[PDB]
């Protein structure tokens, strides 16, 4: 197993941060450090005040290096908020003693891993997130994996995917520090938070196969995630957005839901919010899971509507039915407004696919896509108007299964 090479395993256990690898490294906690009492059992750090938060992990004895050759791998889940593209320099995870060791930091849209041999010798490698795809900041959970071979390459992975590979030329060896300090420290040239969970160190070079297994094993893939990677929940306000139309928010005109262009990318707080409601499922713990039957409520002008099918003023195309906001009872929601959810995560986003349910069962009649169509809504009368609407393709939709126009994300309102 790959756990045979695991020399450190920082985990929250019984509301206490500790090493669970077996090597029993000392873990001291100081300042404002908040531990999550539920999964993923993360710990939260800040960057403001003298009491900001500090986790000192002192590796107990030399034992830990007893099975090491010239390779080691670091892996951890991490979330940063608000990770703006013009963020100033911050060292976040430091393990450098006497100008030797390694250090992880963040600056602008870069997460940089620096490997130090001495004063004069260091090599770094980074992941830079796509600014155009994250205009509101890269504020989502992501899985870092960093592998290093002194006689080979220095590699970095994000969400199981290889981002960059640099050959180790300048560095001959590394005398590692026995201390690792998790603390957000501003580099000498608005406040940000950082969540971390399952910080592992391995005494070997993990390959792509092992990194993807590790990536998936640390997740509950059946549990659908919100836009930031947290567990999607019932009975909670979200902004429902389509992957292909991130600069659109949800609005209403007559029976129909319509998508309008948002004002800016400061945040997603614009338009009407949805609330997800459970109908069927194997578990009942508030979390939304794959194959759950559900429906959507939305409050508009102090009245709640449910998302459901309606007849458009004229036909939009073969096997297409538009999704509108309707004030109707549960029997009608079960017939014409119930959906079977299915998680759909990619490197770029945590999303989902929604299939039209037959009588609130797991039987599928169609898939929820998006598109612009010319017809009449609300007080329209004289002319037809192009409306970007959510639309269900029924019966025949195998080609839409692979389309990103069926990928829906949920941004929490909070």
């Amino acid at each position: 197993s790959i756990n045979d090479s695991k020399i450190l395993s920082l985990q929250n256990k019984k509301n206490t941060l500790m090493d669970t690898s077996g090597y029993n490294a000392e873990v001291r906690v100081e300042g404002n450090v908040q531990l999550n009492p539920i999964f993923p059992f993360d710990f939260k750090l800040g960057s403001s005040g003298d009491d900001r938060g500090k986790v000192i992990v002192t590796q107990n004895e030399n034992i830990v290096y007893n099975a090491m050759y010239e390779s080691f791998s670091i892996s951890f889940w991490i979330r940063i908020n608000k990770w703006v593209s013009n963020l100033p320099g911050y060292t976040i995870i430091d393990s450098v003693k006497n100008n030797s060791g390694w250090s992880i930091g963040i600056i602008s849209n870069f997460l940089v891993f620096t490997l130090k041999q001495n004063e004069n010798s260091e090599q770094d490698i980074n992941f830079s997130y796509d600014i155009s795809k994250n205009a509101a900041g890269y504020n989502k959970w992501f899985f870092v994996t960093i592998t290093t071979n002194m006689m080979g390459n220095m590699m970095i992975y994000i969400n199981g995917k290889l981002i960059d590979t640099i050959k180790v030329k300048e560095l001959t060896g590394i005398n590692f520090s026995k201390t690792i300090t998790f603390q957000m420290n501003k580099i000498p040239n608005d406040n940000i938070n950082m969540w971390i969970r399952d910080f592992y160190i391995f005494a070997k070079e993990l390959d792509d196969k092992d990194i993807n297994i590790l990536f998936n094993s640390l997740q509950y893939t059946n549990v659908v995630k919100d836009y930031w990677g947290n567990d999607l929940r019932y009975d909670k306000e979200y902004y429902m957005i389509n992957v292909n139309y991130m600069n659109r928010y949800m609005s209403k005109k007559g029976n129909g839901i319509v998508f309008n262009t948002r004002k800016n990318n400061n945040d997603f707080n614009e338009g009407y919010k949805i609330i997800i409601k459970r109908i069927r499922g194997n578990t009942n713990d508030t979390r939304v899971r794959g194959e759950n039957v559900l429906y959507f409520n939305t409050t508009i002008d102090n009245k709640q509507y449910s998302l459901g099918m309606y007849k458009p003023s004229r036909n939009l195309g073969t096997d297409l039915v538009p999704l509108g906001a309707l004030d109707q009872p549960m029997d009608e929601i079960r017939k014409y407004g119930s959906f079977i959810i299915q998680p759909c995560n990619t490197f770029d986003y945590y999303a989902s696919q929604l299939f039209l349910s037959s009588n609130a069962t797991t039987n599928r009649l169609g898939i929820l896509s998006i598109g612009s169509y010319s017809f009449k809504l609300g007080d329209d009368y004289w002319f037809n108007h192009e409306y970007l609407i959510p639309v269900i393709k029924i019966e025949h939709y195998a080609s839409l299964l692979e389309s990103t126009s069926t990928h829906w994300v949920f941004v929490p309102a909070s």
Binding site: M309, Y310, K311, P312, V321, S358, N363, I394, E395
Partner: peptide, 15 residues
């Protein structure tokens, strides 16, 4: 299931 599709077409599509 085939009756479900014809029912939806009957209700939500124009004639």
């Amino acid at each position: 299931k085939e009756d479900a599709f014809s029912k939806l077409k009957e209700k939500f599509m124009n004639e």
